[PDB]
Amino acid sequence: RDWSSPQQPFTIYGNTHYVGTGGISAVLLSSPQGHILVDGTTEKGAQVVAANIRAMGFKLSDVKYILSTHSHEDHAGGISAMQKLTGATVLAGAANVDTLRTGVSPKSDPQFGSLSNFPGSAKVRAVADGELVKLGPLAVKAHATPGHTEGGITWTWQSCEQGKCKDVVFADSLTAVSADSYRFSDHPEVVASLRGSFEAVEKLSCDIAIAAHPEVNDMWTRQQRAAKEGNSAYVDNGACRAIAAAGRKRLETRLASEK
């Protein structure tokens, strides 16, 4: 379950499908009018994502948008490759757009330097907080969730199975992690951003959460249970609250370690 590891793709709920790697989430939200891909995984993982979209019976050329949670190599390293394969437009929080275009994080990023540069992508544009991205029957909403990066976005939509519609959340990372030489204690606005993001996420309508690092909402455990339980195994409306709580606990642990 490395960041670039192969992983057999699977439907999560209705037209929401997991197409990421064994260690990093990527989601295809499908429709007869075109698809939306959320995240690219790593540069090496793009080959996995591409293989998985096809394994699910979809054409890469039908992907019209690629949504980015945040501009770290583990989530966005494969976006350029996926962009070339699809012809899609890449959408991201305004403060992460330049990193997506160049592959180089700003010096203000907590993981500047400790995570690698990655390939720059063509066709990147900004979304605003609250912006609705529409594609045929699909409608994905952007929620600004900064802190782990400045331009982090958590993306939400609805998918339906057999007439039962659920609110799906692709949760950006809310973790106070960084280079060894970076101190959150020196960046009080980064900390305030993180705490704002915990509140935003715990308030989301959230039947099904897919965390950018999938184990954060027990993806692999849930997938194993889906075999006998069906896709209800992915449904847990306390999940956004739990991800937010874990971020809050980690931030407290982190600030304590810095003192």
The residue with its CB nearest to Zn ion is: 72
Nearer to Zn ion, 114 or 232 (CB): 114
Nearer to Zn ion, 118 or 234 (CB): 118
DSSP codes of every residue in 98-112 = HHHHHS---TTSTTT
Q: Which of 64, 72, 141, 166 binds Zn ion (CB under 5 A)?
A: 72
Using rule CB under 5 A, residue 74 touches Zn ion: yes
Q: At CA 197, angle to CA 255 and CA 13, rounded to 5?
A: 125
Residue 174 CA to residue 194 CA, distance in Å, equals 7
Residue 187 annotated as lining a ligand binding site: no
Residue 126 CA to residue 85 CA, distance in Å, equals 21
Residue 103 CA to residue 24 CA, distance in Å, equals 18
**Nearest distance, CB of residue 213 and Zn ion, angstroms:** 6
User: Pattern of binders to Zn ion over 23-62, x per CB under 5 A?
Assistant: ----------------------------------------
User: Pattern of binders to Zn ion over 142-181, x per CB under 5 A?
Assistant: ----------------------------------------
Residue 17 annotated as lining a ligand binding site: no
Nearer to Zn ion, 72 or 248 (CB): 72
DSSP 42: -
Residue 158 CA to residue 14 CA, distance in Å, equals 9
Cα radius of gyration (the chain): 17
Q: Which stretch binds Zn ion (CB under 5 A): 2-10, 35-43, 55-63, 73-81?
A: 73-81
* Helix then strand then coil, % of the chain, to nearest 5: 35, 25, 40
Note the residues at the interface with Zn ion (CB under 5 A): 72, 74
User: Residues annotated in the binding site, as ranges?
Assistant: 70, 72, 74-75, 148, 213
